């Protein structure tokens, strides 16, 4: 066994998933001056799914280091130390959609929604998005510089081709990039 990964979707809670016998997860976090708190076994083995551990808002704090260990009947199978702020990785944007901005080419405007769990409205989170699109038959994607907003025009799309768009988000200056949204297929109007 080995840690598959630990992540915090909205900087308020996190969970860890892993790939002998029954594997247990122990954790401790530096509370106060020193790591004085004894190891406590995973508080929730169901919530974040099979082979995971979910730490609700009650066990989640930021800027404080944590250490987790996967244990088996043979001893420690894996260890990992981090502070929640390093593991932020937001969920995908939702409600993706487009609309003509305004005949071989066409300009469109794509818009989505921020992941519902991200407190953007109150300041606890600031995301930036990265949009990608391509013709449905090609294999590479055209990236687009990151944006602070939830609408973005895509210019000069050829009307005679169908496109795909997926947007992904990340907490500014923190963490890595999260999952991509479900793709948005775009078939433009063609004037014969």
């Amino acid at each position: 066994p080995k840690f598959t990964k630990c992540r915090s979707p909205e900087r308020e809670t996190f969970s860890c998933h892993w790939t002998l016998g029954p594997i247990q997860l122990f954790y401790t976090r530096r509370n106060t001056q020193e790591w004085t708190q004894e190891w406590k076994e995973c508080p929730d083995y169901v919530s974040a799914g099979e082979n995971s551990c979910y730490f609700n808002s009650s066990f989640t704090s930021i800027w404080i280091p944590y250490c987790i260990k996967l244990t088996s009947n043979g001893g420690t199978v894996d260890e990992k130390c981090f502070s929640v702020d390093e593991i932020v990785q937001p969920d995908p944007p939702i409600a993706l959609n487009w609309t003509l901005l305004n005949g071989i080419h066409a300009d469109i405007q794509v818009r989505w929604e921020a992941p519902r769990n991200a407190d953007i409205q109150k300041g606890w989170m600031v995301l930036e998005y990265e949009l990608q699109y391509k013709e449905v038959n090609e294999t590479k994607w055209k990236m687009m510089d990151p944006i602070l907003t939830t609408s973005v025009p895509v210019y000069s799309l050829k009307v005679d081709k169908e496109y795909e768009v997926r947007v992904r988000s990340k907490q500014r200056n923190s963490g890595n990039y999260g999952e991509f949204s479900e793709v948005l297929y775009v078939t433009l109007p063609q004037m014969s």
């Binding site: 407190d119 409205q121 300041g123 606890w124 200056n173 923190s174």
Partner: protein, 180 residues
């Protein structure tokens, strides 16, 4: 009597805080990606004598509830104190910033930014008029590599704190500066 919109000011404070956090975060990633393998990182973390930051003597909130429960003045004060705590110690990463693939990284640029935001937050407090209010900044009590990675590690954390706390006061103080 009405009041002048705080947006321009918040806007400028917030650009600096993100510039500072951005430098802290990249600078740190770089160094860590060259001299610190996860093994040392863990032993660094499990040993407070090396990982516990000087700035940590300033009582700051640690989760969302805690933070959004503090007034704007306290959050501004906490941020002021963290910024002051770094004015002197940034003179220490001179070399790290030196050999870094800069992109703006230098003890001087970073220091001028601190001086800049420091004043900007003092202005914001006068516009928005306890231990925290009686407490002064944290003095830095001080191998080379473990001293630097520690300075960097603490620089990133505090900069995340400042950008966060200021963002919160901002969403509260400025008409939909976070919404729609």
């Amino acid at each position: 009597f009405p009041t002048i919109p705080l947006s321009r000011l918040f806007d400028n404070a917030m650009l600096r805080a993100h510039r500072l956090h951005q430098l802290a975060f990249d600078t740190y990633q770089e160094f860590e990606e060259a001299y610190i393998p996860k093994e040392q990182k863990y032993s660094f973390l499990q040993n407070p004598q090396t990982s516990l930051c000087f700035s940590e003597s300033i009582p700051t909130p640690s989760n969302r509830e805690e933070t959004q429960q503090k007034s704007n003045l306290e959050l501004l004060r906490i941020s002021l104190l963290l910024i002051q705590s770094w004015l002197e110690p940034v003179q220490f990463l001179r070399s790290v910033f030196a050999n870094s693939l800069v992109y703006g990284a230098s003890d001087s640029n970073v220091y001028d930014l601190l001086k800049d935001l420091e004043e900007r937050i003092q202005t914001l407090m006068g516009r928005l008029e306890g231990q925290i209010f009686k407490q002064t900044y944290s003095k830095f009590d001080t191998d080379a590599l473990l001293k630097n990675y520690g300075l960097l590690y603490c620089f990133r954390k505090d900069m995340d704190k400042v950008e966060t706390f200021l963002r919160i006061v901002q969403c509260r103080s400025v008409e939909g500066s976070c919404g729609f």
